[PDB]
Write a protein that binds this ligand. Sequence first.
Ligand SMILES: Oc1c(I)cc(Cl)c2cccnc12
Ligand SMILES: Oc1c(I)cc(Cl)c2cccnc12
Ligand SMILES: [Fe+2]
Ligand SMILES: [Fe+2]
Lengths: 332, 332
Amino acid sequence: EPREEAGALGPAWDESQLRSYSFPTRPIPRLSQSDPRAEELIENEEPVVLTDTNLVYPALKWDLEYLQENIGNGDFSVYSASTHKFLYYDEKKMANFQNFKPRSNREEMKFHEFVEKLQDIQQRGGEERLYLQQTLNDTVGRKIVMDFLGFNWNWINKQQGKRGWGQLTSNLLLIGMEGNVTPAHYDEQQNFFAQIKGYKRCILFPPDQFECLYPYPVHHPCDRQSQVDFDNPDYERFPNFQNVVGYETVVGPGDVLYIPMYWWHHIESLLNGGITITVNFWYKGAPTPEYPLKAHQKVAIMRNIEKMLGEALGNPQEVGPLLNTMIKGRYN
Amino acid sequence: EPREEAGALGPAWDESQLRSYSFPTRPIPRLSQSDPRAEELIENEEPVVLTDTNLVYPALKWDLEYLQENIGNGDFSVYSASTHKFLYYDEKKMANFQNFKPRSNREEMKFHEFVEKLQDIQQRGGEERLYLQQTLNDTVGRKIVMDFLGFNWNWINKQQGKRGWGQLTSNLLLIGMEGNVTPAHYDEQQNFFAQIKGYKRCILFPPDQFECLYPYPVHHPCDRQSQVDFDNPDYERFPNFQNVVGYETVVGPGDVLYIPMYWWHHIESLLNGGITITVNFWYKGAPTPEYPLKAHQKVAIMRNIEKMLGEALGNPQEVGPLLNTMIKGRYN
Ligand SMILES: Oc1c(I)cc(Cl)c2cccnc12
Ligand SMILES: Oc1c(I)cc(Cl)c2cccnc12
Ligand SMILES: [Fe+2]
Ligand SMILES: [Fe+2]
């Protein structure tokens, strides 16, 4: 059931704001940071919404206005698509596949310019949507640095210690528009996903559902994304999508979602629900210490064979025919 | 056309002694050792029958009687099958596959005992056939050592030098019974196949016909053999067998066949043609020095991925499902 906001301000969100999908899902547990079960889920690399970290307390005041006034005149990466689906591609790998035009084009700008194109689009009721994805570096204004400084570093660094994780690799900041979807993909890093403004539906799939999810080829610029269009699944090409079962939740201002290493996540900003703000924190996982082997290690292996083959053969286009030659009438 | 033996002794063999097969084949060139074209085929790793090496001149006198009188009382590996097809299995790998009973059972013995079971079988018109495959070591009698000593070492060692090949790894000696088939398989070593007594039909396939030949899984005890039963090919399981094209020849006393590294060979002793004797010499190929990649190197690669996977997963039975997970809806 949708959560009731304090002081009776009404339901935070309602069902009609969520897209409809072919697969069932179960709920991710919402817990307190002090709960022993949350700690148990994290070490066990299972998802968990932590409702009371205060991780990004100072950022909760943030709207566009405030950020405009304070982030300063630096350069911000802005992605742009004529549709609700924001398929991230990888630029390095574009060389690997020629018959692939990007359907979502990046563009650098200043915050006011991003806010410009934002207010405009809404004022002219357009279908174009936008995402601001910017790895928070240095150019940022004094107040925002003060906001940053006030994040709950005690809590997060102590999680990094207990999990024996490696180093904080990045802090993306995300500002998007209502209805924005980030299609299913997995990451190699442990992730804390800190919600700030707006509501996001997060659907997660364990790594053992590799077979139902059909990642793009490793050398493909969409490496790590599902090939399956969730809005129109192709059961002829992707029969095992019919078997997919997700874990689902809705995060709002103050919630931190642990997205474990190698879990798929598909993320959507609520329809008619306004802009969204998230900040995420990524940590390199603990290093390798044993059988039975875990699903994610098997995924590591498939990736590695694929990388190796592309090297040995001098050509990523040849990986697929070599793999078929290897299994046809032999392993299949 | 079948070759005419000197002094008009009649056709060496006739068509009716050859089994009938679903695939076409072309002839391997019969050449002289002095011919520049033979040297050109060898360095190019293509097959060639050399008609005048004198490689095993002293052994041409050998029949059963002579060998009995001279090889001495040592131990000789003898394979035994209730059929014409001698499927060699690998003993180490038997652990890897349980639902596999060997259909051709080995047995050690003395030469007279082998000759015993030979004369008997013929006298009692039986379907059981036998092969003597013995890596010539030391136990052998003085005359046979003298025979050995007289082989054309000048010629063979000078081939090893020119080809930059590594070391002579083995000298099998083969004595079999008429109609014996050795089903298609490939070897990793360069091979000189020296015919001595009887006639053998050798059908060879280049390594680029991997796809039509369907080798068993690398961890299978029949690793390196075709899965295809040439006498009853299963075009449902092995569709690309329909595309197979071989190079064929008939070798007799005095002929040496170069079987290049990684070429498939399927070998059959002529029907109604009596016992056969061969001695083969195997050399480790030249070491690796470049694209485009050669078929055999690609075969090296498929083998390696397969070996790696079996290691990483701690279980050869899991190689196949991991490979399918890796290609299904991804590369196929
Ligand atoms: O890597 C990510 C980006 I970039 C943007 C979003 Cl919305 C994500 C959401 C969940 C997990 N990872 C995400
Ligand atoms: O490895 C071999 C054995 I053991 C027995 C036979 Cl009649 C062969 C014939 C051709 C090539 N290799 C062969
Ligand atoms: Fe992600
Ligand atoms: Fe062989």
